[PDB]
Amino acid sequence: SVDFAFELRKAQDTGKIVMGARKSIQYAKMGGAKLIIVARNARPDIKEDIEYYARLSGIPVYEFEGTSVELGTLLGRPHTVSALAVVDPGESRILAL
């Protein structure tokens, strides 16, 4: 079974993820990510805007059922993270989400 927290840290420390709504949206437009993850309390424009382009680009979107503050903590960051793009899963199974 897939554990979200464990696979995300593994992606972060062994693959390549980029954090932020604006960069995620940019990656979605370019077809440049294998998965986007958004926080449950990310702003609706961020959700909808990411979903708009990720759907068109064929990039799955996964909703993290926690807050952007929690998402930042998981990623060892002091600020909230409302969305991130997985460019390379690395050694993780995060794409199994």
From Swiss-Prot:
Cellular component terms per the entry's GO annotation: cytosolic large ribosomal subunit
GO molecular function, one term: structural constituent of ribosome
UniProt keyword Glycosyltransferase, yes or no: no
GO biological process: translation
Annotated keywords: Ribonucleoprotein, Ribosomal protein
InterPro entries the record matches: Ribosomal_eL30 (IPR000231), Ribosomal_eL30-like (IPR039109), Ribosomal_eL30-like_sf (IPR029064), Ribosomal_eL30_CS (IPR022991), Ribosomal_eL8/eL30/eS12/Gad45 (IPR004038)
Source organism, top-level taxon: Archaea
Ribosomal protein among keywords: yes
PANTHER family in the record: RIBOSOMAL PROTEIN L30 (PTHR11449)
Family, similarity comment: Belongs to the eukaryotic ribosomal protein eL30 family.
Protein name: Large ribosomal subunit protein eL30
Species in which this protein is naturally found: Thermococcus celer
